[PDB]
Amino acid sequence: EVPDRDPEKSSEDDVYLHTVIPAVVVAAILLIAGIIAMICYRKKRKGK
Amino acid sequence: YGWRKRCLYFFVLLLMILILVNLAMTIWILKVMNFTIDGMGNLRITEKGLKLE
Amino acid sequence: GILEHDPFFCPPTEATDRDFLTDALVTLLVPLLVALLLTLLLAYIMCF
Amino acid sequence: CRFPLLLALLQLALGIAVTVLGFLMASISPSLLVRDTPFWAGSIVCVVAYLGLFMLCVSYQVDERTCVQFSMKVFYFLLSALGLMVCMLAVAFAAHHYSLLAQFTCETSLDSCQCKLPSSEPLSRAFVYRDVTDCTSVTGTFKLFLIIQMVLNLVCGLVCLLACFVMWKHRYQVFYVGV
Amino acid sequence: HKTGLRGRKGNLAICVIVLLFILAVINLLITLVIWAVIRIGPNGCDSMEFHESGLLRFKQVSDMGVIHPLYKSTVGGRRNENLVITGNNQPIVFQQGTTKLSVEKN
Amino acid sequence: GIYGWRKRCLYLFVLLLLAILVVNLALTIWILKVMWFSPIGMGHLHVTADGLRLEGESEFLFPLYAKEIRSRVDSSLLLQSTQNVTVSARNSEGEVTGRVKVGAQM
Amino acid sequence: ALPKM
Ligand SMILES: *[C@@H]1O[C@H](CO)[C@@H](O[C@@H]2O[C@H](CO)[C@@H](O[C@@H]3O[C@H](CO)[C@@H](O)[C@H](O)[C@@H]3O)[C@H](O)[C@H]2NC(C)=O)[C@H](O)[C@H]1NC(C)=O
Ligand SMILES: *[C@@H]1O[C@H](CO)[C@@H](O[C@@H]2O[C@H](CO)[C@@H](O)[C@H](O)[C@H]2NC(C)=O)[C@H](O)[C@H]1NC(C)=O
Ligand SMILES: CC(C)CCC[C@@H](C)[C@H]1CC[C@H]2[C@@H]3CC=C4C[C@@H](O)CC[C@]4(C)[C@H]3CC[C@]12C
Ligand SMILES: CC(C)CCC[C@@H](C)[C@H]1CC[C@H]2[C@@H]3CC=C4C[C@@H](O)CC[C@]4(C)[C@H]3CC[C@]12C
Ligand SMILES: CC(C)CCC[C@@H](C)[C@H]1CC[C@H]2[C@@H]3CC=C4C[C@@H](O)CC[C@]4(C)[C@H]3CC[C@]12C
Ligand SMILES: *[C@@H]1O[C@H](CO)[C@@H](O)[C@H](O)[C@H]1NC(C)=O
């Protein structure tokens, strides 16, 4: 009793998730923050 | 100031052109190597050697 | 006088190299046009 | 003020909820990687909310308008920003794993949830799970748990973004005209 | 008074610009090192060619060391020319358990 | 200088550049991690001008359409198996006609 | 001249 078959399809998905995704989300956060700041920033006249 | 502004603008221009050149080279590396989510297409470098697919 | 059929031995055909010229032209023209537009913008608001 | 207090209360509630969900994730089966259980992000949000409650108590108690108050208001703001970033990252990880898990057929084995993704050719990725009571029980409720958890971190990230936005709008939106 | 970048903020801006420039230069150096080491050129990797239909095509003298065929992998000759196995002044020894077939010298 | 709208455009430009640079750095790190990069070559796959080289095993799925297998100068090529070693040939019709087989005992 | 984006 010793069966051995090798259909294993290894793929480097852990590295992609650990590396690309955090920087993509950081870039998205920075972009939305910049756009919001530019739309805002002195849209209101504080009279008196 | 009339002299530091030129330096700042030139540095911004150089920074951005360097970034664009680097981005183009990296995109070329990605395209010519058939990079995908899984990895280097069929090749897969492992701790003992290679593993073609 | 036939032993095996093995309909799996398919050698790679006369597959010529894929034309890198078109994609290289695309990915060289995009940054070239970007740089040209940038130089025009620099001339425009640096000289005015 | 009142609105920052409400935001901090919502932050603490959502942090405790996501930490409870992550603890349940860990307790169900040790078949899942540390990344797939975002309870660390929940703990980060929890300490964020603890700092927030302490902030909104001390601001209503004493020392309201000194320089150091702002000096760690900036700390509060950046900490909430990192909380939002970690929540969005957890959302992305959960979405990727759910997308992987939602388009495959699985079968049961004697002691594990051994199965493979649909494959054009007979070699493909294989996944096995610890101590599976039934492959039709863990898989079938794991998706529901994932969806609920996704909604949880989405709301938590939105709340964090609003908390970051409110104080900045307090500072850099109104400019004084008269004197 | 005056408007714009006046005091410490100008120094902070110039420091941030310098730091960003340093980071960009470091990234460019890393990419250039990659290009130099792997010999990436306009014609491709210069040693392999990742075809679209999942077929690597080596184009240089390859030293694979030890080969471990696993499944559906049968060493075959190229398209309709030959399959020549040569031993550079060394015997070519087939094997199966105890059965042998050794092409030595003489 | 940089009084008004120029400042609020320069800040946005710097932010966009920083985001692009961060994404590029992430891509570079991903490349450095997918390929086990060393100053000599990818992992143990040493790369030089003449060609490739290995140090260790090399698993292979699917057929291998080599042109001419050779052997090292200092060692004798030693093909091996456990069941049998089959060498075949084909006619103009792509059919097996002659074949040698190093079997279990004969 | 309070500076921000
Ligand atoms: C050299 O050895 C190999 C492996 O020991 C032999 O291959 C084996 O051939 C037998 C005979 O057909 C196969 O048995 C049957 O094959 C059919 C194919 O469809 C399958 O449907 C049956 O269930 C049964 O397995 C056997 O599978 C096959 N083994 C492998 C690993 O391919 C080969 O015949 C030997 N060559 C000579 C000349 O003796
Ligand atoms: C095959 O031929 C070579 C070359 O003649 C033989 O090598 C000789 O081996 C003997 C004893 O091992 C030495 O004394 C000679 O000096 C070798 N000759 C050379 C030129 O080096 C080899 O022995 C032959 N193989 C067999 C099985 O006879
Ligand atoms: C704003 C900036 C960061 C955008 C950068 C876009 C880059 C990362 C994207 C846009 C287009 C993409 C390419 C589009 C098509 C293919 C072919 C595919 O078989 C392999 C990936 C490859 C080669 C992609 C690699 C990544 C790529 C170059
Ligand atoms: C938000 C801005 C700043 C940046 C956005 C970057 C996005 C669009 C880019 C960056 C890297 C890119 C990936 C790079 C490589 C691949 C592998 C390819 O086989 C499929 C596409 C895929 C998975 C790309 C998808 C798009 C991608 C994620
Ligand atoms: C009336 C009360 C609420 C005003 C309090 C002022 C607060 C909200 C303001 C004053 C100064 C501001 C900070 C000034 C500088 C930085 C660094 C910058 O890279 C991102 C924004 C950040 C982090 C700001 C966040 C908001 C901030 C802390
Ligand atoms: C090899 O494959 C290509 C596919 O692009 C085909 O056009 C060509 O005819 C094939 N060559 C032979 C000899 O079959």
Nearest C-alpha neighbor of C15 from the set F66, E84, E56, B36: E56
Question: A9 CA to chain E: closest CA distance, Å?
Answer: 12
Query: Which of D39, D7, D8, D41 lies closest to D24, judged by CA?
Result: D39
Would you say the C-alpha torsion D83, D88, D91, D92 has a positive or negative sign?
Answer: negative
Cα D161 to the center of its chain, rounded Å = 13
Report the alpha-carbon distance of residue F104 to residue G5 in Å, rounded.
80
Which of the other chains make 3 or more beta carbon contacts under 8 angstroms with chain D? A, G
β-strand pairing of D174-176 with A44-46: parallel
Q: Where are the alpha helices (DSSP H) in A1-48?
A: 14-39
Phi, psi of E92 (to 5 degrees): -105, 115
Residue given tokens 């990436």 in the structure block: E40
Contact across the interface for F104 and E99, Cβ inside 8 Å: yes
Among candidate residues D24, D49, D38, the one with its CA nearest the CA of residue D150: D38
| Residue that has been written with the tokens 């990344």 in this structure | D35
Q: Which of left, alpha, beta for C8 (phi over 0: left; psi -120 to 50: alpha)?
A: alpha
Task: Give the SS3 label for residue E41.
Answer: strand
Residue ranges of alpha helices (H) inside chain C are 20-47
CB of F16 closer than 6 angstroms to any ligand 4 atom = no
Q: How far apart are CA E87 and CA E69, in angstroms?
A: 20
Which position has the token pair 């940089």? F2
| Max CA pair span of chain G | 12
- Round to whole Å and give the CA distance between F33 and D147: 31
CB G5, CB F6: distance < 8 Å: no
Return d(Cα E69, Cα C1) in angstroms, integer. Answer: 30
Strand partners, E61: F51
Give E69 Cα–ligand 1 centroid separation in angstroms: 17
In angstroms, rounded to a whole number, what is the distance separating the alpha carbons of residues E10 and E71? 65
Helix (H) or strand (E) holding D145: helix D138-171
Contact indicator for F77, E90 with CB cutoff of 8 Å: yes
Please indicate if any CB of chain D lies within 8 Å of the CB of A5.
no
Ligand lying nearest the CA atom of residue E102: 2
Burial D148-159 (b: 16+ CB within 10 A, else e): ebeebbbebbeb
Q: How far is G1 from chain A (nearest CA, A)?
A: 11
Conformation bin of residue E56: beta by default, left when phi > 0, alpha when psi is -120 to 50: beta
Residue C14 makes CB contacts below 8 A (sequence gap 6+) with E79
Nearest CA in chain F to C9: F63
Residues 6+ apart with CB under 8 A from D28: D138
- Distance, in Å, from the CA atom of A6 to the CA atom of E48, rounded to the nearest integer, reads 26
Contact B14, B20 (CB under 8 A): no
| A48/C7 Cα distance (integer angstroms) | 89
Nearest CA in chain A to G3: A41
Mutate to test the pocket of ligand 1, among F84, F85, F87, F99 (most ligand atoms within 8 A of CB): F84
Burial group, residue D8, by CB count within 10 angstroms (0-12, 13-18, 19+) = buried
The strand pairing partners of A45, in sequence order, are D175
Q: How far apart are the C-alpha atoms of C38 and C44, rounded to whole Å?
A: 10
Distance between CA atoms of residues D145 and D177, nearest Å? 53
DSSP state of B42: T
Inter-chain contacts counted by CB atoms under 8 A, chains C and F: 17
A7 touches E: beta carbon within 8 Å: yes
User: Residue D106: which of D117, D115, D94 has the closest Cα?
Assistant: D115
- Spell out which residues of chain F touch residue C8, defining contact as CB-CB under 8 Å: 63
Q: Is B52 on the interface with F (CB under 8 A)?
A: yes
Bridge partners (DSSP) listed for residue B52 = F60
